[PDB]
Amino acid sequence: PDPSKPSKRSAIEDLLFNKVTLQKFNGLTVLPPLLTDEMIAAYTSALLAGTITAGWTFGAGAALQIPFAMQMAY
C-alpha cells in the first residue's frame, strides 16, 4: 500500500476492484458484512509485510529485519 492516501489498497487491488465494478422487495433485505473491506486490506497488508520482513521468523519474537536475499537463497 502507498502512504499517499487514498491509497490504502495497492495498484493491483484497485485494478481488481474496478474490474469487479464494486431495497424495495418488501421481505427481502441484505445485511452488511461484519468485516469492512478496509479491515480485509489491512489484514492482507499486515500478512505481506510480515512475510516480507521477518522471513522465517514470522510469528515468534524476532522483531528484526532479515535481509531479503537471504530468504531468496534459502
Place this chain on the structure above:
Amino acid sequence: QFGRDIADTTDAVRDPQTLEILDITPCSFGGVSVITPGTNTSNQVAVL
C-alpha cells in the same frame, strides 16, 4: 401515466392536475436485534 422498474413494480406516478411525476418509496421495514449481556451480571440491554 406512470413508470415502472426492472422488477415490473410501480416506481413513479404523475399528478393529473399538476402534470409532474412523483416518486414512490416503500415505508421502511427491517428486523430488530436485542444485544444483551449474561443475565448473571445485569438485566440492562441495548437494541439495534
